[PDB]
Design an enzyme around this catalytic site. Structure first.
Site, short mmCIF file in Angstrom:
data_model
loop_
_atom_site.label_atom_id
_atom_site.label_comp_id
_atom_site.label_asym_id
_atom_site.label_seq_id
_atom_site.Cartn_x
_atom_site.Cartn_y
_atom_site.Cartn_z
N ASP A 229 -8.47 -1.79 -3.36
CA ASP A 229 -7.68 -1.20 -2.30
C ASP A 229 -7.85 0.32 -2.23
O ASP A 229 -7.18 1.03 -2.99
CB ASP A 229 -6.23 -1.57 -2.49
CG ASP A 229 -5.38 -1.26 -1.22
OD1 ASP A 229 -5.92 -0.80 -0.19
OD2 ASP A 229 -4.13 -1.37 -1.31
N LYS B 70 -5.49 6.35 -0.12
CA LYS B 70 -4.65 6.66 -1.26
C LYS B 70 -5.09 8.01 -1.87
O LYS B 70 -5.84 8.08 -2.88
CB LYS B 70 -4.80 5.57 -2.34
CG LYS B 70 -4.17 4.21 -1.94
CD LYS B 70 -4.43 3.19 -3.04
CE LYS B 70 -4.02 1.79 -2.57
NZ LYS B 70 -2.54 1.82 -2.39
N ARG C 214 0.16 -7.52 2.97
CA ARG C 214 1.03 -8.40 3.75
C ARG C 214 0.24 -9.04 4.93
O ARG C 214 0.57 -10.15 5.37
CB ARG C 214 2.31 -7.69 4.26
CG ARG C 214 2.04 -6.59 5.35
CD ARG C 214 3.30 -5.83 5.48
NE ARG C 214 3.40 -4.95 4.31
CZ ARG C 214 4.35 -4.05 4.18
NH1 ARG C 214 5.21 -3.85 5.17
NH2 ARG C 214 4.40 -3.27 3.12
#
Ligand code: ZN
Ligand code: ZN
Ligand code: ZN
Lengths: 509, 510, 518
Positions: free
Chosen positions: B286, B293, B370
């Protein structure tokens, strides 16, 4: 007692309204059977459709031909039940009197939550603030138990009331129609007491720090106690020094206001079967101290709200002193101070000694609430009580765990925690049980002092704060409610007065 | 199924050790009535002294050696204490005139040791095992443990002892003395299986994202399914397009690895009484995507671990396929992909369509988990199961709510939540029930799409993500286990393989 | 023309609604002197009280119905006041014994309503239409408005009422019905009748802009947007040309091409033209910034407050220009030739992207040192301005979501205008006044020009010392117009309605008025 001033314009008391326009509202509850009369003011039907965004249908008989016509299914079909949606219309009734009639949509689910009912009430109040009316009548075509009925009234009163103390025509009658009305009548005056306790807490919280300081807050508490005939004791700095409350005194060192410790007592006339201490965190402004609240999202402008736990406890004293429960003795305590930056402030790294002898290494001066609660808990335990319940705006981390809607309860005793959860259900102030994880305890092991104030590795701050507090309760059932996330209503820009009704239900039931 | 490479030095599979040195250990359980033979290796007494602060050590066991018994006399032993975690070492000659090694590990002052305390005892044992060349370890339980905590002791011993050296350039015998030895024998091979389920998860998680990508991870799943005898299929991009899994497909658009959806099935021989879907978040790296990030504390160097949920579900497929429970059909599902930055990536603001027809407005490309889960949940429900449990490193907010010890569980069914909490007790993997607060649902209302991906007002991100996921389950009992906080052991610098034993005990208990 | 896809579920066009329910509304303007018939649906009085702040409601029109007249007597109305944006609903039976809804919206106590005031009035009116099922609305003006403000009333009522549900699927609004008839009673009605169909054209240009801005970047990319522009041209009979990468290489548009190097979508440059029959007296180029998504590129939008989730809106300038082309193509002004230009591309992170530090060459031969890849808008606009000037035009006006600093100078209500010619600037401020889209003139401060001096290239893209970035961007742009009257409208602060969570379609009416005024 005398409030110190910097300049003569500095306020020396918190203004408080006691007699409010809500108290002048005459409330009547009628059974729906027999039909509703529509003669004056505003009449609102509470309506659901169990479907989603479905049409409004009014099932109640209305004893007025003109209004019945307006309320026919073929006309109301135009409107829909989406939660919080509303419409109202002015029209002539059979007497050619002008009346307003409408509805608030209650959605498509049969059992409304506390949050759903607040949305319904908000939409009702919006109409009240927008219309000059002598009377409001609310017709229940949804099911509500007695507790939720009471909550409907308390929220309606609290949301309707407008706090104008710092600025330079309310209805006079409330009619309610509901099926089996006689069973609901007892809830009316209980709601009016619970409204005022909540509204009184809100007044203390919304009062800015220049008005609400440790001296003026304790003076307000003595005045409350005198109006309700509670015993009261305010402990000053010399007495606190004799009691060796070094953790609480360290926090207040940098303030121009002396520390004042509030202790009010309610005691039933009969036998006392249960003794309870309710401890509220009472920081009247939290700057963060030398760990100043300067980071993005620290919200130092909100920090007059850091005495919210003390306010809930004094709102509960109002309710208790008024409804007068049997068989109990309640102590309402609060270590009140202000957390400021000064040549005289405590510093990060300072080692301080609490009233039970434990030395504490201060790792962050903005974790001052657990220090003032530590000495308040030692005080409460020495009273010889059966339960200690503290309530505090303690950790910002609560916004990341439960958010703005549910408070967190932590404790050392499952029976007591279950009692708080039950009171949460009957007060419709939502709380959720969170764990005190013992594996985190070793992060409070100080190299120099008996214990650290804060963890420097564990991020679960609300759990670490609970582990710290638990060290100051030796052998008593204790629960800690953290209301940092729920105390302030961000959307409405005002306090909730969160916890008065929770704590009162707990004492009463 | 071929792994794409940028250069010929890129790896094309995940290295997986199946027969570990732990599997070579011969384990014997002896009844403590009978006495302890010494001789070989290292003999460790597990001694407590309940009540007494840091009480002295008293060895209660009969020891079938005159010499070693004279050494372990209260007189000599009084100088040592039972402080939880302590240990000592002794050297002596036995009745044979042979030198032997003996010592103890202190188990503290409660009579009923807790889980995390048993871990502290095990860690002390492993320290002694790491330090010295030994053929045999003998452990004498002078404390009381039930079957369940005995199993936990073994699993933890095995897991902690096992060292992962796949990316660098042991005892042969374990003897256990315990009271009512016959009642504990069953636990030995169950601990061995659970140890391997957990270590297997840990090998996939620890494997970096260059070795473990969506193609090599689904290849490893097919290989596991083949070794167990599970039905499998891997759905590739063309089938996923046909199924209209637009939310999952959007996440993987910026990756050089094609999306691969893993579907394994275990079915019992008899009547099938319960149908279960276990769904693991499978993000092999990720980056955050365009919502990179890059903030301090975002931990982008940890994000090979974002497929921990998929790892736990595969570890659980190892335990289930090995133990072979009756009366059950279990589907093991993971929507595997990689969230990267590319001219091909999905963008903040994109409106994407999930496989149940719901349009979703993406507000932050780093809330990708999600989105992949939403499509995997619609797929699970189309299977006609009775329960859907998902497990996922979903939100970093878990670090602020429960921390690094307890996972959070959320769901739409109290009975299923309760089964999960029971399995948490019996697996010894701690979980805490958290609420899906419906008041926050209004903050997912989108002006343009059917629903927003994220809340722009609510900071309780673990609850908001659960509210989102709940929109993808129409009419089935469902629960969701957020392991973001618990999956990596920051102290030991390695995965815990959290969730394998929790999920297995859930399936076995049913 | 063909839109590239990564997977088969990626969209290949922007959905566009042309025949909207507003187009089905029959509108009739009646003179108020004849009195109001009240026979069905909802009738709303627009009512003020000049002088008396929060004064009472008093209806001044004759109403041709005994019952409704009785309800509207002063005694009955006195409980109500005229505070701006306040409203009430009444229900009664008329003389024909049919149920009828009647109401009012308060228009305050100052007889001259600003654009923001009239917007609050419309918003309250639209709340009365939502969550109600009605076939007919009638509006009675008991206030004084000029022709432009009456047109603004209708444009705004239409735009705010229309709901954009193109991307709804399982959540389409079941209870959304639109009126079929709109009646308007006003003084000297014959004089306002001309504004009705002009309002309808202005509403649609503006709604059309809004549809393109609101379309997410995966629907609206440089290929799908340039395709929608061709469709629009074809429906309007405009001449059009879309220049592709090979043409843009031949034109040496190096600044514009560097920005789109990192995108999977080829650069597309839109050129539409409207030309009057007969004598062409004025030639105008309108240039809109058309970045279909702005990630920032390697200077990624990662800082707190950078709002990367909003950046589909960075083609808002190109949308305004296209909405203008709609109104111009529809209304057919005489004596003008208008070129509608946009250098469309997407600013992405890739192995292929341009980098901070790169030196690129614009189509006028100027070398530019890139100091920040997120200053990409002025690089595209530099090549578009060279192109516009080579057309031999009298005025060049560009419109662009250029600098976030607009939020700190003018905020969300007024756009800023900069330029090199005071007559042009004044024509823009004039059109701002007649379109009711507010603009404020801001200066191009030449003392800052030295901070664009580059050690290696002819010029820097960005200042490293001056923080007034809306001014610096304008000085940069001014270097790409040699000898033509030019103005630049920065709409970064006004383009998105943060309160209502949708585009304003800002600029379409400002640019049309500017064209029509000429
Ligand atoms: Zn505080
Ligand atoms: Zn992730
Ligand atoms: Zn831009």
């Amino acid at each position: 007692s005398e409030v110190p001033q910097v300049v003569s314009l500095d306020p020396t008391s918190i203004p408080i309204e006691y007699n409010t326009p809500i108290h002048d509202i005459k409330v009547q509850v009628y059974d729906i059977k027999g039909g509703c009369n529509v003669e004056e003011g505003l009449t609102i039907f509470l309506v659901n459709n169990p479907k989603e965004n479905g049409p409004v249908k009014i099932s109640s008989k209305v004893n007025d031909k003109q209004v019945s016509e307006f309320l026919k299914d073929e006309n109301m079909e135009k409107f829909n039940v989406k939660l919080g949606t509303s419409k109202h219309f002015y029209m002539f009734n059979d007497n050619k009197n002008s009346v307003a009639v409408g509805y608030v949509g209650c959605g498509s689910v049969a059992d409304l939550s506390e949050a759903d009912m607040k949305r319904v009430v908000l939409s009702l109040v919006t109409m009240l603030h927008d219309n000059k009316l002598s009377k409001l009548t609310v017709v229940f075509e949804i099911n509500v138990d007695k507790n939720l009925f009471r909550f409907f009234l308390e929220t309606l009163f609290y949301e309707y009331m407008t706090d104008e103390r710092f600025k330079s025509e309310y209805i006079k009658h409330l009619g309610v129609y509901i099926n089996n009305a006689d069973t609901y009548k007892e809830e009316v005056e209980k709601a009016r007491v619970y409204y005022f306790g909540t509204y009184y807490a809100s007044q203390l919280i919304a009062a800015p720090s220049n008005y609400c300081n440790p001296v003026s807050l304790s003076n307000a508490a003595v005045e409350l106690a005198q109006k309700l005939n509670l015993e009261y004791k305010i402990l000053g700095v010399k007495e606190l020094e004799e009691l060796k409350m070094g953790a609480y005194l360290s926090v207040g060192k940098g303030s121009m206001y002396p520390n004042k410790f509030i202790h009010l007592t309610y005691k039933s006339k009969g036998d006392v079967k249960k003794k309870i201490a309710l401890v509220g965190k009472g920081i009247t402004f939290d700057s963060g101290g030398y760990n100043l609240k300067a980071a993005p999202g620290s919200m130092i402008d909100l920090m007059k709200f850091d005495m919210s736990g003390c306010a809930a406890v004094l709102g509960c004293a109002y309710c208790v002193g008024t409804l007068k429960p049997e068989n109990v003795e309640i102590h309402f305590l609060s270590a009140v101070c202000e957390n400021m930056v000064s040549k005289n402030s405590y510093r990060p790294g300072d080692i301080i000694t609490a009233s039970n002898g434990k030395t504490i290494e201060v790792g962050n001066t903005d974790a001052e609430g657990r220090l003032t609660l530590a000495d308040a808990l030692v005080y409460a335990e020495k009273l010889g009580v059966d339960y200690i319940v503290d309530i505090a705006t303690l950790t910002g981390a609560m916004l990341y765990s439960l958010g703005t809607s549910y408070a967190g309860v932590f404790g050392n005793n499952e029976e007591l925690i279950n009692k708080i959860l039950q009171s949460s259900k009957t007060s419709n102030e939502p709380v959720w049980w969170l764990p005190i994880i013992n594996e985190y305890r070793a992060t409070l092991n100080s190299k120099y002092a008996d214990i650290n104030q804060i963890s420097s590795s564990v991020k679960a701050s609300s759990i670490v704060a609970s582990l710290f507090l638990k060290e100051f309760v030796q052998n008593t059932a204790w629960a800690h409610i953290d209301i940092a996330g729920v105390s302030w209503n961000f959307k409405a820009r005002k306090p909730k007065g969160f916890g008065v009704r929770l704590l009162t239900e707990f004492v009463l039931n």
